[PDB]
């Protein structure tokens, strides 16, 4: 499974969660930014690694980072 990580520069704009095509990410309450929320990656076994989320992220230096790692039939996106 690929690794996904969130860094605390995240402004909680949610754009990565909406971009994700397999629901890897969710918003969780946080006190660190004005939006009072931060991203989270509790379902990386469904993560395919398209990096649509990084494309969505506004922070100078990504707040969401995808490290491609061990391949499974889920990360490889196989339907067979």
């Amino acid at each position: 499974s690929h690794s996904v990580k969130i860094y605390d520069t995240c402004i909680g704009c949610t754009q990565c969660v909406r971009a994700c095509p397999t629901d890897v990410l969710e918003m969780i309450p946080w006190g660190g930014c004005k939006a009072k929320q931060i991203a989270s990656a509790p379902r990386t076994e469904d993560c395919v690694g398209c990096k649509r989320c990084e494309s969505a992220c506004p922070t100078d230096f990504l707040s969401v980072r995808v490290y491609l790692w061990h391949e499974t039939t889920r990360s490889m996106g196989l339907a067979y």
Binding site: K51, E54, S55, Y67, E71, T72, T73, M76, L78, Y80
Partner: protein
């Protein structure tokens, strides 16, 4: 961690065909296996070197064995200029009768291959004469192959596993490698030249059974120990000496004559014996520099630490560099590959111009294969040198322990470095291409006198400083009263001045405008290839487009289509790009070497001097002209011994072109296609019964770059080798 890649459970658990591919490709990257330690890393490398020695010895043993068993060495040594040397027999049941006849050459009783490796000239020059000589040599190397495997196995056993601290004892390894690996081996090699090779050249037969009863020199060791060393140079071979006979044979063992044995056209054996003795003394003294167990010698760390300019223009100088190097194996291998790459080119440049082996100068195809083989080997080795510099920067570099030192300061001004390589490459490309294109247009328009044809005056002035008189510059050794000329008049200059001004050897060939243009082509290739490689190494840790690149490692497919697109952003991809540029560069240098020599050998250098200043000349008068025998190795009218090279020539074009598929079409196209084949397979009766155990998937992004590169490189090399060998051997220059 239970199937195929035992060192990578990450891969063992891949359910796709990708598992098998990457298991193969990562097997030698020890650092990235499950649960490697520093100790295991060193120990695996150490045993892996013994296996590499074992293969090298095994390979040489077979070459000896096959020449003795199926070659014509004994006929070659009796008439070295009229016998094509045999590599080995061929036994191919696909052959038709006309192929059996055409390949039956030499004095052989069946189809054979002719050797372009030069081993006959090599082995003959150093003393080998009989098939038996070759047999016991092969057996001895077989023994060395076996011993190398014994030690490899041994040192992987817990009782004999060396500690990390031993592998990092740098001062001791240097002392031993300089004085022993280099020095004693060179001293011993001079001992072989004096005891066996030189008597062989004078028609004597010195072997293990009799070498104790025969003197290498009539005065024994007396002159050695009394200091009367001149006696060993006293009575050198005549310039009319006939190699392997006593005709004009002298008794000197150590000389300094310069130039060539006039009949063999290669260096004097007594010069080569003196050379190996002299450098041995230097290695043996030099190997006493570093401190070991005896309370004298240097600390390399202290030496580095002391070399910091007062005034601060190199910050902290070389402080920290001992452990940066001594703790990083990629740093060490980078320096090793960089240095070996330089001297592999040195070998190619010096062997064609100052051959050591009797009767190799007139074996034109051998000289062509040997030069081409080492310049391509050298090119690959140079790209590896930078690739492991990059890997060093990612895996091993510690910014804090290198703070402000010469290595860190390279990273600080990478934009200065990279943008000047960029500038130098742009300058050389615009002008070199601009000048060739101008000349082409002038030829096109029937006005060759309007070419731009710059004389390589700086190099011609260097040839004149060396004593060549072709250009009238009269400098240094070309002068009449330079102290340089006066000091060497009594020693090596008579034989050297003779060789350098003989214009039918390869020592310092005459050069004009054609040599100017292609040397700037070559400088373009060196500059651009290092641009790719330096930019690759210096951005490996990070760029503005990917400031955390170090967190992703040396090779990764990319960083996705965001931030504008990031294909081919890793340091591994910069290497991949540089291979094309290295293959380009060596292509230019080897084209040049070959075309300069084939027109030399044919007796009309003017074909090169005139057709090389424009590019249509290269295409037509080099490639097209010299392809006619090769492409007729088989035709609707039959075939001949050039048939193999004609077939390999096209084979090379085919492999190269197949590489283009993996390089141009990328993964997603092929993954979707494979899916329709997964469907089709699971819906086809009878074939339904059979099921794959590994899910079929398109190759990885990086994988395809590699597979394409390998196809490209393989076809590149096979195409040119087929052409090189056929064109040169079809006529003998």
């Amino acid at each position: 961690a239970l199937r195929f890649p035992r060192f990578s459970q990450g891969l063992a658990q891949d359910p796709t065909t990708r598992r098998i591919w990457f298991g193969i490709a990562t097997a030698h990257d020890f650092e990235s296996h499950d649960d490697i330690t520093e100790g295991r890393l060193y120990q695996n490398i150490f045993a892996s070197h013994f296996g590499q020695l074992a293969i090298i010895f095994l390979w040489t043993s077979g070459n000896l064995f096959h020449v003795a068993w199926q070659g014509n060495f004994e006929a070659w040594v009796q008439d070295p200029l009229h016998v094509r040397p045999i590599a080995h027999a061929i036994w191919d049941p696909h052959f038709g009768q006309p192929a059996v006849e055409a390949f039956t050459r030499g004095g052989a009783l069946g189809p054979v291959n002719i050797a372009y490796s030069g081993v006959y000239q090599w082995w003959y020059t150093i003393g080998l004469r009989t098939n038996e000589d070759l047999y016991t040599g092969a057996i001895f190397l077989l023994f060395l192959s076996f011993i190398s495997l014994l030690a490899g196995w041994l040192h992987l056993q817990p009782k004999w596993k060396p500690s990390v601290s031993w592998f990092k004892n740098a001062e001791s390894r240097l002392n031993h490698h300089l004085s022993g690996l280099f020095g004693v081996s060179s001293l011993a090699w001079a001992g072989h030249l004096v005891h066996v090779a030189i008597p062989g050249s004078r028609g004597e037969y010195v072997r293990w059974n009799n070498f104790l009863s025969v003197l290498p020199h009539p005065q024994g060791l007396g002159p050695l120990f009394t200091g009367q060393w001149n006696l060993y140079a006293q009575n050198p071979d005549s310039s009319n000496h006939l190699f392997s006979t006593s005709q004009g044979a002298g008794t000197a063992i150590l000389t300094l004559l310069g130039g060539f044995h006039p009949q063999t056209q290669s260096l004097w054996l007594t010069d080569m014996a003196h050379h190996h003795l002299a450098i041995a003394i230097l290695f043996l003294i030099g190997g006493h520099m570093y401190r070991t167990n005896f309370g004298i010698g240097h600390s390399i760390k202290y030496i580095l630490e002391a070399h910091i300019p007062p005034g601060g223009r190199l910050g902290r100088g070389h402080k920290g560099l001992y452990d940066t190097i001594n703790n990083s194996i990629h740093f060490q291998l980078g320096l090793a590959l960089a240095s070996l790459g330089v001297i592999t080119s040195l070998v190619a440049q010096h062997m064609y111009s100052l051959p050591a082996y009797a009767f190799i100068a007139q074996d034109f195809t051998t000289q062509a294969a040997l030069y081409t083989h080492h310049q391509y080997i050298a090119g690959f080795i140079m790209t590896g040198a930078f690739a492991h510099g990059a890997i060093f920067f990612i895996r091993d570099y510690n910014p804090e322990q290198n703070a402000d030192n010469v290595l860190a300061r390279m990273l600080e001004h990478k934009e200065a470095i990279i943008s000047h390589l960029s500038w130098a490459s742009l300058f050389l490309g615009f002008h070199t291409l601009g000048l060739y294109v101008h000349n082409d247009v002038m030829l096109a328009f029937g006005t060759p006198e309007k070419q731009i044809l710059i004389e390589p005056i700086f190099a011609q002035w260097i040839q004149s400083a060396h004593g060549k008189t072709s250009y009238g510059f009269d400098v240094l050794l070309s002068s009449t009263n330079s102290p340089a000329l006066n000091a060497g008049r009594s020693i090596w200059l008579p034989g050297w001045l003779n060789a350098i001004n003989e214009n039918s050897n390869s020592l310092f060939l005459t050069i004009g405008p054609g040599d100017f243009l292609v040397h700037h082509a070559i400088a373009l290739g060196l500059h651009t290839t290092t641009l790719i490689l330096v930019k690759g190494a210096l951005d490996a840790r990070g760029s503005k487009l990917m400031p955390d690149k170090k967190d992703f490692g040396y090779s990764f497919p990319c960083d996705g289509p965001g931030r504008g697109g990031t294909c081919d952003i890793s340091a591994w991809d910069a290497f991949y790009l540089a291979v094309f540029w290295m293959l380009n560069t060596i292509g230019w240098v080897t084209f040049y070497w070959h075309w300069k020599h084939i027109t030399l050998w044919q007796g009309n250098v003017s074909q090169f001097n005139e057709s090389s200043t424009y590019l249509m000349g290269w295409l037509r008068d080099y490639l097209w002209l010299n392809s006619s025998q090769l492409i007729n190795g088989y035709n609707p009218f039959g075939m001949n011994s050039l048939s193999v090279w004609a077939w390999m020539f096209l084979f090379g074009h085919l492999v190269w072109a197949t590489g283009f598929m993996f390089l141009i079409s990328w993964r997603g196209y092929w993954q979707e296609l494979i899916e329709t084949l997964a469907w089709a397979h699971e819906r086809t009766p009878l074939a339904n019964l059979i099921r794959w155990r590994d899910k079929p998937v398109a190759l990885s992004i990086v994988q395809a770059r590699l597979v394409g590169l390998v196809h490209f490189s393989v076809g590149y090399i096979f195409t040119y080798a087929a052409f090189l060998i056929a064109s040169t051997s079809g006529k003998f220059g």
